[PDB]
């Protein structure tokens, strides 16, 4: 009967379910959230369109939202990040999901569009986003629909051209006013990642943001955990699964020393690499120098590093000029959200030899080769399994609490068409939910100790400005 | 010739000059400040009263201020922290300084008052403060001079009696209106410490703050170096100098995991200890757990750890009950708040045996002993040498740019009678000034890249909410 | 065409060749050995029977032996360690290989026996062994063939029942005297691993060793590189691929702190675990303690560790009683050569649920579960890809040099029926061949300095009993 | 004795005693040895001449030897290594000691000679040596006494000149045959350090060794603990006390990656330095590269490192050409046994400015300076306190046992005029004595497990060639 999904192979559902069961044990924050909020059904009547890597971890999130009352449609936010067994389990549970590892860019955007065609008619009333692509579709569509169609005839990348072609097709095919109808019905968006959050604040600042938004990335229990420790665990996992290279004895270069760069550099250092870093920000650079990382330019690194990782959220970090200078069989990859950190398109006239899924060897006219991972897309999710469940539990608890805020706790319009963050009390609660599983025994302040440092015994323990 | 100083012994000057020269090499931020800002002489006409630990590192700051054009008078902000050779080199350079290691509290206050007797007869026009004592003298005198004198007759302590007696003395020995003359001439204060900033925010809230203030404590470069990196460099140094214990093998317990506890745990783990941590903040606790530290209560640690370090800023962290349970010759020290993390008064009826300065052995009735460092005062200052010069360069370069901001960049009254923090471009500038010496090569954004991430090429590169 | 092989799927050959090409770049020792010895063909006339994990790295070894003139037959030395694409590449090159990932124990032993059926008739004249199974088949058959057959009726396990049945089958199906013919024709064996080497010294001390043997494990460039750094890279790789667990925050227990145990503890510690160790040797225990590992018994660790790894080469390290006490979903695995470190057979009456290949969940009557990796067989090879190519280049250059010594350099009978180690000049040469690839710049002793410390400028640099 | 000693200040005895008491708790090996052998008095009749750094740790060894029945005379084996409180405590206990921190080379050698003038007449009958100076005095005097005197007129250093003048003075002043009488009466020497042991094997090879010798350095519980973990603790201790520089981010260069260099590199990396190494031995170089150190020549390092440490046992490692190329205020030191690793003599025509004890600034004609620690003598002992007590307990338990072997257990002449090492049974015993203090619980093999791996349940657990 149920056919409203696109997955690689529904027979993977049982395997998916086994690994989802294992992840539940490792995701105490999600599981406690189900227990606390299940009886309250705060998401009853929510119609959540999610665009977030369709992994086993995400499957636990999906089922949490469903356990709280939500009706759901889902897609991945990257073409290579889906775990097909996870997608199959979600589909077998009767939830619409459109996600295949190795789907094309065309497919990616057609699937994103399928979020907004709700079963039984109508549209979503919430978005849960990672990177802002779903949110961008609604806003670009609404822009074009109100008459400003000129940006669509003017593409400047392959993905961008596919995107514009999609918006034109929806405008042609859907009823008139369809983007405005969606816009009107979306009660809020919660956004997972640094790149997506930037896109939000750009819209808020231009006055074009169409609905309230919560920035989940800037919870301390997301940015200082997921971005940092998740990358610490999953960067080298992606490199090893892709290449099986010996990391001890190698020189690695990491571009960027923000939250993800700090994690990435650590990942490699802990695996035995001698790590160099680039930075444009002098504070971040000084932080890298204080951890004993050599801070150099990509020009200085290009001829000598064995492994290159972009972690900036910026564009044109590793250029064709750098790659021409690289040693034979240098490994290149990207852990930032989008592939344009590396000039992949500049390599497309060269000879590519596919080694295996998400691993390609690219040969230059002088016969030197480079090893490219996931065609420059997120290496941790492309070549491995992304961040482990325990850390994603912290991120996804924050997401769930964000969806509850926007969907259930905005009766008094406390959330306007602006970008908000979760309050410290909720940030601390998320951490508190993860302590027992890892055997942490938290100290309780006596009343006089609490008074002495100016806090309540139950928190919050730190000012909103505190950097951790 | 020059006689406007009070020091232990002016014959120490040559020795002081030799140590200052060595420090300069390790204070590149200050020395670069002299090079870059010297040509414009932005502190020409500044009359700076400084109250800050009269050490060799502070002398390099003093001479940097003078190299930028400033006329200066100086005192220590603490009776014990003066290095007499540093004071003597400053006096021998023709700069009024009133600082002697081990001066009385009465002398401490009379010397503070001498800041305000400018050569030629005026007052200072800038204050550079650590702890707020100089700023408090001005505010207390002003309050009294304006007719509200009752508070001067109600001292809470011996120290307070001495301060109040000083205020009374200045009201009789200086002209009517002297405190109002000082307040009208002070263009700003820059304050380095939490106790001093707390005092500023209390006055600003009560509408009693007499001039603009910059909170230097809050900058990323100041807080990280003073709290994190300085303790990371100096905690184990103090333990070794005091005890010469082998740290490999040993179990250490660190109470608190904010910036000082982070640095302290790291210092100990680096040195080979198996480190446990206590925390009351679930976020900090989760950070400690994710770094591989066992998070336990002090009751669980007490019978177990070989070394204890308090780093909380709170009181009654290590109690008599804990110390009764400790193993024989456990080492106990404090790196946090100046006093009363450890219940030192509770040990007052036990047998104390002095080993050497700042190291005592305490015997209990059951005959187990503990080794106490610095009588439970700060171990990095009592048993070692405090923060290394490079670390102090970060803080003092912040101070220098704050003095420039208030003295030279307030023509348009951007700084009113309120408490401000240094804007991010100056926090970034502090980092920039240290990069050449530590061997960092920074990357410059191209125009399209700066556009892409929504920053100017020259910074600032992060929002004011970014946590690093 | 050529059909003398058993592999999973010959169509994997192209994939295998691509990864073999990638491995060659990472294996400068083997590639330099080909260049040096290829013209002299020192293995022309060798008939090498290899029993060693049929991985991509081993494929480069096989092709090195062939380049030096050897005729070869190959099998894996573990039922789960074959890399099917490697096996397929070797079969497609026309080399007999009998190796499938996930072969049964019966297949395993029948394949081992196929080594000795040389193409055209007759036997091998060299053995290259890892763990001593091939060598044991020859000695056991010889023992039984000479009249001593009682041992064959007393199996101590399923594997032993199968092995004895094989020897019985061979004594019936092969000509009378076949084992003695094999024994007479084997010029030597080189042995890779600690366990196989122990088996060789057992036979040598008993006077039963039938041919000369080189102990390759005790080259410094093997034991202090491949056992140590190889496990440091590959243990956590196995655990991540099998479980995708978050290691930061977890407690792990490693049984053993010899070379493999040292590497294994480091693997886990570098990945973020709090690591405990067991040991029987007080020197190795004290080393673990000085490196900051908690040293405890398995009974102490059993209820509390999240991950258990056996690294001893001994038996009955993790017993049914331990496993009954483990926390729900503890992970258990083995990186020692044989599976009897864990009592897997004691688990066979419990409920086993397969998760995916080499990952099983086992449920006890009280409903707690454990996650078992590779059914207790080598986790690094079973759940991941074994040690990376670079470190295996050192081990396999030693192997190649040992095969040359026994096959080509024994005309004067310098190698009798005893166990030998390669000399320090060859061990230093193996290290030298790897320096350029990793960017090491070696210092040359001035003649006066060489004289001063009593070495030649070209080495050797250390005494034969130097421990590195 | 009452009179028979030279120390800096006998009034320091009480302080010395307090630190000795504290060290005893940290030295379970020595205290266990006193407890076992004190009642057996195995050293009764021994007259031990000890030449070993007169530190607090040595004071515990001396008092152990005395508790075992020994009569003792002692000197330091380095001019800057004495801890004057330690020396004073020994003098106050009535033991002849001639040791002052900062004694001259003339005094050093005169004090060594005093060893041999036994109180009450006669000579020692045992030597305990660290570096071989006491042993060299006997052998050089013997050589000259037997008629071969020409060498005494051909010194190659100032220290040799002093040494040869001493040998001449003794031949002139002592009775005819004095060196032959000493040589006859010495029953053995135990030697602590790698350089001293090299001196012994050289005498043994040329047949000039006059008495049996035990190489203590090559006990596993010495070489793999003291040389390695001791330096890991004490190298950075010396650099910090000497200089107080911030170590995070500094680049350091370590010459040598043997036991001491491995420890030294670890010391600096653990303190936050980015560490480079040099080596001549390709195996040791490959070890350094695999641990992530950049392996470079001193020529490459000279212009760029901030800190240089020589750890080779060789000479002319840091030449005047290297030092001319160093950056201003680079720090230079030596942790090898003698002051010729650095070309200190070539610096003597330059301007030296003393900073504090064991710290000097040397200015070159182009005005760049370097910071020299301890005039190029052992930095850990000269600028700090040497290795901490607990690891010295391991070395000094080996020494005590070696003294017992040579003095009490040579009735059957199992020890000839050659160099021996202690058996593994004793090496293991030393490790066992330290386990309880550090909290190790050792696992006990069942009989079947001991048989399975070919060891006795009580050990030894490893073959004599095992490298740990
Ligand atoms: N699992 C993942 O792969 C994962 C997880 C979290 C976030 N992300 C993505 O990673 C990217 C980075 O996120 P973040 O949270 O670390 O951002 P961040 O702002 O904390 O850090 C980025 C850093 O890049 C630096 N930078 C910018 N341009 C540079 C250049 N040309 N050269 C060198 N450095 C440069 C910045 O100064 C900044 O410090 C984003 O795209 C984010 O969405 C990925
Ligand atoms: N020794 C020095 O040289 C030096 C330098 C800088 C700061 N400090 C001082 O160190 C102290 C801490 O500074 P900080 O910057 O780390 O502050 P912080 O606020 O960043 O961190 C303190 C931590 O202690 C924790 N805490 C509070 N009470 C606790 C309790 N009963 N048990 C366990 N944990 C508890 C808090 O949750 C907090 O995370 C302050 O007093 C500060 O002034 C000392
Ligand atoms: N997985 C791989 O890739 C790989 C690589 C190399 C070696 N190995 C194998 O690993 C095993 C160990 O090799 P190794 O070279 O480290 O041996 P080793 O002899 O150096 O170390 C083994 C240690 O186990 C300890 N031990 C013995 N019984 C014990 C017990 N009951 N409890 C705790 N500790 C105990 C010993 O004291 C010893 O220190 C062998 O089977 C070897 O063949 C596997
Ligand atoms: N300061 C201390 O407390 C302490 C403690 C133990 C030993 N020592 C002394 O330290 C020295 C070294 O001892 P060890 O046990 O490490 O010896 P080792 O033989 O284990 O190591 C010395 C290393 O120096 C290397 N080497 C030699 N010449 C070199 C050169 N020109 N450049 C670079 N590397 C070179 C060798 O290859 C060797 O690996 C000896 O003098 C020893 O007595 C000092």
Domain boundaries, chain C: 1-228+387-468, 229-386
Chains meeting D at 3+ CB pairs closer than 8 A?
A: A, B, C
The CA–CA distances, whole Å, from A282 to A256, A313, B462, C446, D175 equal 11, 17, 11, 44, 75
Q: Does ligand 2 come within 6 angstroms of the Cβ of B22?
A: no
> In chain C, how long is the greatest CA-to-CA distance?
73
Which atom in ligand 4 lies closest to the alpha carbon of residue C446?
A: 31
Sequence-distant (6+) residues with CB within 8 A of B63 are B20, B93
Q: Within 6 Å (CB) of ligand 1, which residues are found? A: A 193-195, 227, 230-231, 255-261, 278-281, 284, 311-314, 317, 335-337, 378, 380, 386-387; B 443, 445, 449, 453, 461
CB contact under 8 A, C468 and D283: yes
Sequence-distant (6+) residues with CB within 8 A of A261 are A254, A255, A277, A279, A284, A311, A312
How far C85 CA lies from chain A's nearest CA (Å)?
Answer: 11
Residues of B in contact with A449 (CB under 8 A): 314-316
The CA–CA distances, whole Å, from C241 to A89, C323, C381, D430 equal 20, 22, 11, 42
How many Å apart are CA B9 and CA D202, to the nearest integer?
A: 58
**Which H or E run includes D41?**
none
Q: Is A451 a catalytic residue?
A: no
Per the rule left: phi > 0, alpha: psi between -120 and 50, beta: everything else, D62 is alpha
What residue in A sits closest to D295 (Cα-Cα)? A249
List the CATH code of the domain at D1-228+387-468: 3.40.50.1480
How many Å apart are CA A166 and CA A417, to the nearest integer?
A: 26
Distance of CA D466 to the CA centre of its chain: 25
Count CA atoms closer than 13 A to A97's CA, side-chain side.
32
The CA–CA distances, whole Å, from B412 to A7, B405, B407, B408 equal 64, 12, 12, 10
Question: Which of D232, D328, D387 comes nearest B25 by C-beta?
Answer: D328
Ligand nearest to the CA of D461: 3
Q: Is B264 a catalytic residue?
A: no
The CA–CA distances, whole Å, from D444 to C273, C335, D291, D453 equal 26, 21, 33, 13
CB contact under 8 A, B248 and C274: no
Q: Are D278 and C443 in contact (CB under 8 A)?
A: yes
Two tokens, residue D123: 């000579």
How many Å apart are CA A121 and CA A141, to the nearest integer?
A: 19
What residue in B sits closest to D385 (Cα-Cα)? B244
Ligand nearest to the CA of B333: 2
Sequence-distant (6+) residues with CB within 8 A of B60 are B20, B23, B24, B27, B30, B31, B389, B393, B396
How many Å apart are CA A240 and CA C234, to the nearest integer?
A: 9
Distance of CA B55 to the CA centre of its chain: 12
Residues in C lying within 8 Å of B, measured between beta carbons: 248-249, 269, 272-274, 289-292, 294
**Helix boundaries (H) for C360-442:** 379-382, 389-408, 424-432
CA dihedral sign, ordered D456, D459, D462, D464: negative
CA dihedral sign, ordered D177, D178, D181, D182: negative
Q: Which of C5, C58, C61, C80 is nearest to C381 (CA)?
A: C80
Per the rule left: phi > 0, alpha: psi between -120 and 50, beta: everything else, C227 is alpha
Sequence-distant (6+) residues with CB within 8 A of C267 are C231, C232, C233, C234, C235, C236
Adjacency order of strands within the sheet including A369-373: A294-295, A274-278, A251-255, A307-310, A330-334, A369-373, A359-363, A351-356
Per the rule left: phi > 0, alpha: psi between -120 and 50, beta: everything else, A359 is beta
Question: Which of C282, C435, C453 comes nearest D285 by C-beta?
Answer: C435
Residue bearing the CA closest to ligand 3, atom 1: C335
Q: Is D222 a catalytic residue?
A: yes
Mutate to test the interface with D, among B246, B247, B271, B373 (most CBs of D within 10 A): B246
What residue in D sits closest to B236 (Cα-Cα)? D237
Partnered with residue B421 across adjacent β-strands are: B215
How far A441 CA lies from chain C's nearest CA (Å)?
Answer: 13
Burial track B424-434 (b if 16+ CB lie within 10 A, e otherwise): bebbbbbbbbb
Q: Are C212 and C188 in contact (CB under 8 A)?
A: yes
Q: Which of A296, A290, A254, A289 is nearest to A271 (CA)?
A: A254
What residue in A sits closest to C229 (Cα-Cα)? A248
How many Å apart are CA A454 and CA D341, to the nearest integer?
A: 58
Q: Does ligand 3 come within 6 angstroms of the Cβ of C261?
A: yes
Residue D50's φ and ψ, nearest 5 degrees, are -110, 130
CA dihedral sign, ordered C112, C115, C121, C122: negative
Angle between helices A424-435 and B282-290 (to 10 degrees): 50
Q: Does ligand 3 come within 6 angstroms of the Cβ of C204?
A: no
Two tokens, residue C95: 């080399």
Q: Which of A302, A369, A373 is nearest to A335 (CA)?
A: A373
Q: Look at chain C and count its residues.
A: 468
Q: Does ligand 3 come within 6 angstroms of the Cβ of C254?
A: no
Cis peptide bond upstream of C266, omega within 30: no
Q: Does ligand 3 come within 6 angstroms of the Cβ of C256?
A: yes
The CA–CA distances, whole Å, from A13 to A83, A87, A93, D265, D403 equal 11, 8, 9, 52, 72
Q: Entry resolution in angstroms?
A: 1.7
Q: Which of D308, D336, D343 to mutate to test the pocket of ligand 4 (most atoms within 8 A of CB)?
A: D336
Two tokens, residue A270: 């802990």
Q: Number of Cβ pairs closer than 8 Å across A and D?
A: 29
Geometric angle at alpha carbon B465, from B464 and B466, rounded to 5°: 95
Residues of A in contact with C385 (CB under 8 A): 244
Determine the distance separating the centroid of ligand 4 and the alpha carbon of C228, expressed in angstroms: 23
Q: Helix or strand or coil: residue D309?
A: strand
This entry's atomic model was obtained through X-ray
Q: Are B185 and B122 in contact (CB under 8 A)?
A: yes
Q: Which of D57, D131, D194 to mutate to test the pocket of ligand 4 (most atoms within 8 A of CB)?
A: D194
CB contact under 8 A, D462 and C283: yes
**Long-range contact list for A35-42, CB < 8 A, 24+ apart?**
A37/A68, A37/A400, A37/A404, A38/A67, A38/A68, A40/A68, A41/A68, A41/A69, A42/A68, A42/A69, A42/A404, A42/A407, A42/A408
Ligand nearest to the CA of C445: 4
Determine the distance separating the centroid of ligand 2 and the alpha carbon of B262, expressed in angstroms: 10
Parallel, antiparallel, or unpaired: how do β-strands D251-255 and D274-278 relate? parallel
Which atom in ligand 4 lies closest to the alpha carbon of residue C461?
A: 37
How many Å apart are CA B119 and CA A389, to the nearest integer?
A: 68
How many Å apart are CA A241 and CA D13, to the nearest integer?
A: 64
How many Å apart are CA B173 and CA B434, to the nearest integer?
A: 46
Which atom in ligand 3 lies closest to the alpha carbon of residue C261?
A: 16
What residue in D sits closest to C298 (Cα-Cα)? D443
Two tokens, residue C32: 């330099």
Sequence-distant (6+) residues with CB within 8 A of C412 are none
Residues of D in contact with C283 (CB under 8 A): 220-221, 427-428, 431, 461-462, 468
Domain range A229-386, CATH architecture: 3-Layer(aba) Sandwich (3.40)
Q: Are B140 and B201 in contact (CB under 8 A)?
A: no
**Helix boundaries (H) for C116-244:** 133-145, 158-173, 178-185, 194-206, 220-223, 231-243
CB contact under 8 A, D280 and C444: yes
Residue bearing the CA closest to ligand 1, atom 5: A227
Sequence-distant (6+) residues with CB within 8 A of D194 are D217, D223, D227, D258, D259, D260, D313, D337
How many Å apart are CA B467 and CA B224, to the nearest integer?
A: 11
Partnered with residue D342 across adjacent β-strands are: D318
Residue bearing the CA closest to ligand 4, atom 18: D258
Two tokens, residue A235: 């960067």
Q: Helix or strand or coil: residue A457?
A: coil
Determine the distance separating the centroid of ligand 2 and the alpha carbon of A291, expressed in angstroms: 22
Query: Which of B24, B51, B53, B233 does the annotation list as catalytic?
Result: B53
Query: Which of B51, B217, B219, B234 does the annotation list as catalytic?
Result: B217
Two tokens, residue A53: 């890597």
Determine the distance separating the centroid of ligand 1 and the alpha carbon of A242, expressed in angstroms: 22
Q: Does ligand 2 come within 6 angstroms of the Cβ of B257?
A: yes
What residue in A sits closest to B464 (Cα-Cα)? A465
Partnered with residue A74 across adjacent β-strands are: A50, A97
Determine the distance separating the centroid of ligand 1 and the alpha carbon of C80, expressed in angstroms: 40
Q: Are C357 and C102 in contact (CB under 8 A)?
A: yes
Q: Which of D381, D387, D385, D397 is nearest to D60 (CA)?
A: D397
A40 secondary structure, DSSP code: G
Parallel, antiparallel, or unpaired: how do β-strands C274-278 and C294-295 relate? parallel
Q: Are B185 and B211 in contact (CB under 8 A)?
A: no
Distance of CA A328 to the CA centre of its chain: 32
| D1-228+387-468 against D229-386: fold identical | yes
Q: Which of D444, D461, D466 to mutate to test the pocket of ligand 3 (most atoms within 8 A of CB)?
A: D461
Q: Which of B55, B234, B312, B378 to mutate to test the pocket of ligand 2 (most atoms within 8 A of CB)?
A: B312
């Amino acid at each position: 009967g149920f056919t409203d999904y696109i997955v690689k192979d529904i027979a993977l559902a049982d395997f998916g379910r086994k690994e989802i069961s294992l992840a539940e044990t490792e995701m105490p924050g999600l599981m406690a959230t189900r227990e606390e909020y299940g009886p309250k059904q705060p998401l009853k009547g929510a119609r959540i369109a999610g665009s977030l890597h369709m992994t086993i971890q995400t499957a636990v999130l999906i089922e949490t939202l469903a356990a709280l009352g939500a009706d759901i449609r889902w897609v991945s936010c990257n073409i290579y990040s889906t775990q097909d067994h996870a997608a199959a389990a979600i589909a077998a549970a009767g939830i619409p999901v459109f996600a295949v590892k190795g789907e094309t860019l065309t497919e990616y955007w057609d699937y994103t569009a399928k979020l907004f065609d709700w079963h039984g008619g109508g549209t979503p009333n919430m978005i849960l986003d990672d990177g802002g692509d779903a949110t961008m579709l609604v806003h670009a569509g609404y822009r074009a629909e109100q008459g400003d169609t000129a940006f669509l005839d003017k593409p400047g990348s392959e993905e961008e051209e596919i995107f514009y072609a999609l918006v034109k097709r929806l405008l042609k095919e859907k009823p008139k006013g369809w983007f405005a109808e969606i816009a009107k019905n979306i009660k809020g968006v919660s956004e997972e990642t640094t790149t997506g959050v930037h896109r939000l604040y750009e819209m808020a600042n231009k006055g074009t943001l169409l609905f309230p938004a919560i920035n989940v990335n800037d919870s301390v229990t997301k940015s200082k955990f997921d971005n940092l420790y998740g990358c610490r665990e999953s960067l080298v996992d992606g490199i090893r699964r892709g290449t099986d290279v010996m990391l001890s004895g190698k020189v690695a270069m990491v571009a960027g020393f923000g939250d993800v760069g700090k994690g990435s550099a650590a990942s490699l250092r802990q695996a035995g690499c001698r790590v160099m870093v680039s930075e444009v920000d002098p504070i971040c650079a000084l932080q890298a120098a204080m951890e004993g990382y050599e801070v150099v330019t990509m020009e200085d690194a290009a001829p000598r590093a064995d492994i290159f990782v972009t972690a900036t959220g910026n564009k044109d970090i590793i250029t064709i000029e750098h790659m021409r200078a690289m040693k034979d069989r240098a490994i290149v990859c990207n852990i930032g959200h989008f592939d344009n950190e590396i000039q992949i398109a500049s390599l497309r006239n060269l000879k590519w030899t596919n080694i295996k899924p998400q691993v390609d060897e690219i040969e230059f006219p002088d016969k030197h080769r480079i090893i490219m991972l996931s065609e420059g897309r997120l290496v941790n999710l492309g070549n491995a399994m992304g961040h482990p469940s325990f850390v994603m539990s912290a991120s996804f608890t924050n997401q769930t609490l964000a969806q509850i805020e926007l969907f259930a706790n905005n009766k008094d319009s406390k959330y306007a068409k602006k970008v908000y963050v979760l309050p410290k009390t909720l940030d601390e609660k998320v951490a508190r939910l993860h302590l027992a599983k890892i055997g942490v025994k938290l100290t309780e302040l006596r009343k006089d100790q609490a008074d002495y440092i100016g806090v309540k015994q139950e928190g919050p323990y730190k000012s909103d400005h505190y950097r951790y």
